Design a protein around this ligand. Structure first.
Ligand SMILES: NC(=O)c1ccc[n+]([C@@H]2O[C@H](COP(=O)([O-])OP(=O)(O)OC[C@H]3O[C@@H](n4cnc5c(N)ncnc54)[C@H](O)[C@@H]3O)[C@@H](O)[C@H]2O)c1
Ligand SMILES: NC(=O)c1ccc[n+]([C@@H]2O[C@H](COP(=O)([O-])OP(=O)(O)OC[C@H]3O[C@@H](n4cnc5c(N)ncnc54)[C@H](O)[C@@H]3O)[C@@H](O)[C@H]2O)c1
Ligand SMILES: NC(=O)c1ccc[n+]([C@@H]2O[C@H](COP(=O)([O-])OP(=O)(O)OC[C@H]3O[C@@H](n4cnc5c(N)ncnc54)[C@H](O)[C@@H]3O)[C@@H](O)[C@H]2O)c1
Ligand SMILES: NC(=O)c1ccc[n+]([C@@H]2O[C@H](COP(=O)([O-])OP(=O)(O)OC[C@H]3O[C@@H](n4cnc5c(N)ncnc54)[C@H](O)[C@@H]3O)[C@@H](O)[C@H]2O)c1
Ligand SMILES: Oc1cc(Cl)ccc1Oc1ccc(Cl)cc1Cl
Ligand SMILES: Oc1cc(Cl)ccc1Oc1ccc(Cl)cc1Cl
Ligand SMILES: Oc1cc(Cl)ccc1Oc1ccc(Cl)cc1Cl
Ligand SMILES: Oc1cc(Cl)ccc1Oc1ccc(Cl)cc1Cl
Ligand SMILES: [Cl-]
Ligand SMILES: [Cl-]
Ligand SMILES: [Cl-]
Ligand SMILES: [Cl-]
Lengths: 290, 293, 288, 290
């Protein structure tokens, strides 16, 4: 049981919660870390900054097999642009394209069992969809949607039959969340549809499964960066109006992904699964209702 | 405390209830069967003749463990709802406490409060009839037995369940897309069960911190399935094994594994949901003939 | 073109709005009027109380072909219960069952081509779903959902091919609306599913189309009989729907009239939202 | 009432069917024609090759207000690349960018009432999703999805009160259609999501409505160019298994588009309306049951 988790930058996101929960099941875990934060992550980890965040309970802490620099906007080394080659954080680093990381993992560890796509990006997220530029829009689809397909395409050859693949989405794909701008809504819409199409292909040709988890709000780094703030309203609305009022943890999403990545979920594929305390089911805020 | 599950809708070892039972016991969850009185005795005779002994094996070193088996009719909420004919029925008279209220109270006396509840049952007298030609009594019977029964079970079991408890039912994709042959208001009853799962999840969540979901299952050759009007169930299985993204035979235990996950605390942020456990066949639009190789 | 419109009690509901819009397209309209309110309706009509409400524009007035008593609880006269036999409001009336009304319409005007189901009922609507009784839930399904099926079964043989059928639903079927109790949510969910299954059977065997309009909130008599629920619903919708305009009964009538016509002949089994776009929204807008 | 129809390259598509049904309600019609096929269209039209296809009934025939070159690849003139600029079919054409045509329509005809998006393109449609390149994918999203956004953005300030917008999508967005490759599934998924997001911003800022029609299969030039071929299979299945067994015509979609573009439909926005003889509602083939 080896899982590659792409899209860990710190201990505050969904990627860390998935790591944690899978570690609970003695899955070996490999982090794919975006190069602009790689060296920072590695320093904090080496200086024990996350040690407390690695604790599960009395007698298991997390065990991280490897941490690799990983940029899912580049499929192969030939795709790396000149702007990126001329960026100091990327220059120390090698083998950070989807193809390169897949080759490295395979040669180093052999075939793996699970894959987590826990990343997204969009230059113009601050702009509403109507005022998003073409370049901004396509950047969102490239980083947040296409990335999954290419990840699947390069990883299928290094995954065993009956492996499982997970991505994270948001309900803004399906119902309007003002503030979820820059084509991110569009990108999550595509990702949930592509999950179906990929499940057909991965199912039939590889007996590999793929699903997506539509998560509720978490104050991760990426979330707080959208412009108190958007995420703060989102959390507070969720905790007020969700069927289950308890605070939503990265690790609640971690448990469901760990189930979807295991053979326990073997008759589930191509699905969007809501791990959001049931908020998605509500139509009207509850205020007046006695 | 400790995990105890009531599974309403076990009439033999060939249905989803038994798969859920088997997967729950795998996880050392205590399990009580709710068995429809018309088939209660036949079930109890086979269980003691050892006829389920082989179906009860989990593996070389594990066997299922059944805490209790009770007569249960989800047609009746209380004793006073029991009609004249059923009273005169000899399959029912030597059996007591089989109304929804009664079985809850009985379970709560013998064992105290439970953690888990599975609704694994449906009935519809005119299932063989198309929806357009299904009578009012036919339609209301389907809704009564397959949809309202879940609501009543919830209502009565809510006060004998611990907080953080979980509830599941089973549904079929016929609710959302047209399956001819799924007659007699069964389609309508699953549509309602899926809608009711959401509304119940709101009320159960806010007031008791209890979760409820439904599993939309692919085809299984259960006793009931073979009672639908080749036969319906054989085409469904054959079609699904041919056209689903995943070609494996769908097993009751595949539903049971997912059920046990939804019933456990690993799914604590999931509620009100319809979860597809059907090898991904729901995601397909057209048959795959021209395209495949 | 002749349309039977089941579920008119007054000018303030969706049925009247549909009637108004159909009459705009020269469709002849037959009202199915629930017996409790039949007398009152015919009295008010006779004394000219609906005369302003019948004007479409200054060159066109609604024309109403007939007004027939109608209770969708009863498939045949054999189904009428003792309580109803003790109701004077019914004892003075005839041919109000689904079977009888279809026969009467067919005997009187021949085959028709449009049918509108604009009705619902549930005795325990004030009770949340969890504390709704079996009798109450089944009542909601019987009156609000099964009634569509039976209306279809009885009208199919007095309808021409290329006919069209419409009912009204609410988004409580698909997303939680607290206060929409009694199993009304369950009934709308069943109606939307049955709309698909009926579309298949009616499509292949009769070349007949059937769809459901999911309407936004309107301050009808039945709505008010449920802040109050309906004023909350309306305020929220007007606060948050993509479109600010007040939702009018005739905005539904306009879509119903399109769906009932040949212009929508490639559309069947569909739930069409006519609600100022409210259904698309996730979160309140305020801070944004 | 004036409608601009983006995506008519011949009389065999849904664009033509919409133009026909709108002309039937005396709407004035402007075509946005892709420059690569603009000349041949103008030749064919000028020679009478479309006269029979312009016949509506006994006494009415289509009346076209204008026919303009138009490429939804380019938002403004500054976006046009040098290869395109030198291409023979572009270098005598002008004002064919999204912004330029909007401004041309405006000064030529004043403000308009209706806008139809009836285009799609994807350079790698013959490749299944998993095997689609990043560039192909983004090209599908750029031409088939982002273009709607850009059309909206440049047109809103040239639209009259009570204006309405439609585009055309396909059910492969929601359920798997093998063969609908190249990220077209993805693009249609984006389009349907974006239709909701646009409906919100357009409704609240401009009281403008936008919907999408999910059409059944039509033997158009674009459909034939995909691939039993893909389209012949799709039509055969639709005609055998739809609740309504009848040939699906471009005017069937035209009729719905006309409605949605009109004031009869003013309480409808952000929706995906299925015009497919009810095929979308079916689960499995019908063979056994009958
Ligand atoms: N946080 C929430 O409230 C929430 C809700 C719904 C969905 N999601 C989704 O969960 C996933 C993770 O988000 P999160 O909140 O955990 O954010 P996060 O900041 O913790 O993780 C996002 C990660 O993406 C990485 N990344 C960005 N661009 C990349 C690129 N081009 N190549 C490789 N990596 C890149 C960043 O380094 C970062 O570590 C995303 O898909 C997000 O859209 C989050
Ligand atoms: N078999 C399938 O392919 C399939 C597919 C989708 C959903 N489901 C659902 O799974 C659930 C169980 O079906 P199954 O396939 O295991 O068949 P099954 O024959 O094993 O289960 C049906 C059970 O319902 C019980 N029952 C019927 N009426 C009852 C009543 N009034 N009161 C109490 N019990 C009653 C019977 O004892 C019977 O054992 C049902 O809800 C069904 O709709 C089954
Ligand atoms: N008003 C709204 O906000 C709204 C919103 C969404 C959906 N709807 C739906 O639209 C339809 C019409 O409702 P409305 O709000 O216009 O209310 P309404 O009060 O105008 O119409 C309800 C009618 O149903 C009739 N009725 C009740 N029981 C009947 C029976 N057994 N047989 C025949 N008629 C019977 C009543 O006489 C009444 O005239 C209903 O299905 C309702 O659920 C209404
Ligand atoms: N034909 C079907 O069975 C079907 C089914 C569902 C949806 N649709 C959708 O309907 C719409 C119309 O398709 P159609 O089948 O009528 O095919 P079509 O060949 O008539 O339409 C495509 C048109 O778009 C033009 N075009 C392509 N790229 C362009 C761009 N760069 N800028 C401007 N114009 C461009 C082409 O010249 C062509 O005329 C598309 O969005 C399509 O996806 C079609
Ligand atoms: O998808 C999300 C949804 C929410 Cl409610 C919060 C954070 C999310 O994640 C992102 C949002 C925008 C960008 Cl640009 C990148 C990421 Cl990771
Ligand atoms: O729901 C089901 C779906 C399938 Cl594919 C097969 C069997 C099913 O179960 C039933 C079907 C009809 C009746 Cl009357 C009772 C039951 Cl338990
Ligand atoms: O469905 C409805 C939805 C809304 Cl928002 C308002 C009124 C509605 O109509 C009804 C609601 C309950 C009952 Cl018992 C009967 C009817 Cl006619
Ligand atoms: O969307 C469509 C759906 C179908 Cl069934 C047939 C044709 C369609 O339209 C297209 C499909 C692919 C490309 Cl590249 C361009 C276009 Cl216009
Ligand atoms: Cl936005
Ligand atoms: Cl049926
Ligand atoms: Cl309620
Ligand atoms: Cl594909």
């Amino acid at each position: 049981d080896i899982c590659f988790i792409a899209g860990i930058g710190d201990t505050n996101g969904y990627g860390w919660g998935i790591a944690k929960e899978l570690s609970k099941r003695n899955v070996k875990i490999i982090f794919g870390i975006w190069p602009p934060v790689y060296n920072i992550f590695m320093k904090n980890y080496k200086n024990g900054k996350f040690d407390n965040d690695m604790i599960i309970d009395k007698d298991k802490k997390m065990n991280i097999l490897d941490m690799l620099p990983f940029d899912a906007s580049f499929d192969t080394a030939n795709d790396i642009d000149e702007e990126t080659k001329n960026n100091k954080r990327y220059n120390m680093l090698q083998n950070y394209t989807i193809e390169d990381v897949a080759n490295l993992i395979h040669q180093k560890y052999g075939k793996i069992n699970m894959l987590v796509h826990s990343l997204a990006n969009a230059k113009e997220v601050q702009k509403d969809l109507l005022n998003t530029s073409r370049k901004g829009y396509l950047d969102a689809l490239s980083k947040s949607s296409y990335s999954l397909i290419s990840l699947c395409k390069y990883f299928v050859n290094i995954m065993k039959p009956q492996s499982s693949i997970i991505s994270l989405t948001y309900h803004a794909s399906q119902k309007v969340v003002p503030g979820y701008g820059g084509g991110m809504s569009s990108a999550k819409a595509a990702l949930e549809s592509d999950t179906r199409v990929l499940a057909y292909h991965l199912g039939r040709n590889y007996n590999i499964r793929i699903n997506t988890i539509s998560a509720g709000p978490l104050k991760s780094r990426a979330a707080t960066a959208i412009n108190y703030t958007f995420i703060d309203y989102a959390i507070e609305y969720s905790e007020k109006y969700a069927p289950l009022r308890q605070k939503l943890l990265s690790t609640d999403i971690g448990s469901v992904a760990s189930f979807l990545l295991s053979r326990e979920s073997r008759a589930i594929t191509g699905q969007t699964i809501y791990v959001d305390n049931g908020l998605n089911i509500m139509f009207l805020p509850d205020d007046i209702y006695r």
